[model samples]
Target: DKIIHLTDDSFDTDVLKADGAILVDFWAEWCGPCKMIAPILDEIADEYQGKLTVAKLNIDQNPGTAPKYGIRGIPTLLLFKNGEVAATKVGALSKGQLKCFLDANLA
Candidate 1:
């Protein structure tokens, strides 16, 4: 599936209630690392379609979900499965690194 644009309103329905592994990209337009990881997430969203779902929450636009998750920095990636956080990364990662992280968890 293409990356789902998540807002505070839809986070529960889209990510929390979803099946399988879900990757939520907590980001902002002003964040350089967030920009860098955008396309990489695109590749992952395509390659892993059906196996997982990828979503993005713009912290600037959506304020509620970020603070609830204790997001201290931009570009933080939170992986959720069955409505709970499964893993988290605070910085940008290379495609290979990201793939490894997902593989480790999804396996």
Candidate 2:
């Protein structure tokens, strides 16, 4: 399945009420760091497949959710588990770091 696109309108249902873990990428198109993480996040969405929900929330397009989560920068990755914030990482991350974080927190 294609990765879900989240917006300010449906964020609560898409990320918060999801049944399992949700990896939310808060980003904006003009941010370089956000661009750096896009492919990595796409790979992650495929790798995690049925086990997790990967949702991208563009800060430029969907402003509410980003501030609601206190996201001060683009490419902020927030992991939600059990309908609450479980982990968050600011700035860009190496794919290895992303993988390790998933293994440690989501596994």
Candidate 3:
């Protein structure tokens, strides 16, 4: 599945009220570390298709959403499960580390 793209417009209905678990990548275009995690998230999106929803929110394009969630850094990750936030992390991650994170936060 393609990674679901998010903007400030769709954040509430999409990520906030999403049906199942969601792995949201909060990133910006100019952030080097955010760029590094893009493809890694793609791999994870493929790997976790049924178990979770992997999506991206560009902070540069959608400025308000991340701040509402209290995200202070680039490449912040939010794990949403059952309509509530389950886990959060900052910075880039290896595929293996990502897998572990998903497993640990699985619904």
Q: In terms of lDDT, which candidate is strongest?
A: 1
> 2 or 3, which is superior by lDDT?
2
TM-scores, all models, native as reference: 0.96, 0.94, 0.94
Q: Candidate 3 deviates by what RMSD?
A: 1.1
lDDT of 3 by residue, 1-107 (tens): 56999889998788778888988899887899989988899898887788888888888888888888899998899998766789998887788888888878795
Error of 2 at 91 (Å): 0.6
Point out the higher-scoring one by lDDT: 1 or 2.
1
Models ranked on lDDT: 1, 2, 3
Candidate-wise lDDT, in order: 0.91, 0.86, 0.85
Q: Lowest lDDT 10-mer window, candidate 3? A: 81-90
Predicted model with the maximum TM-score: 1
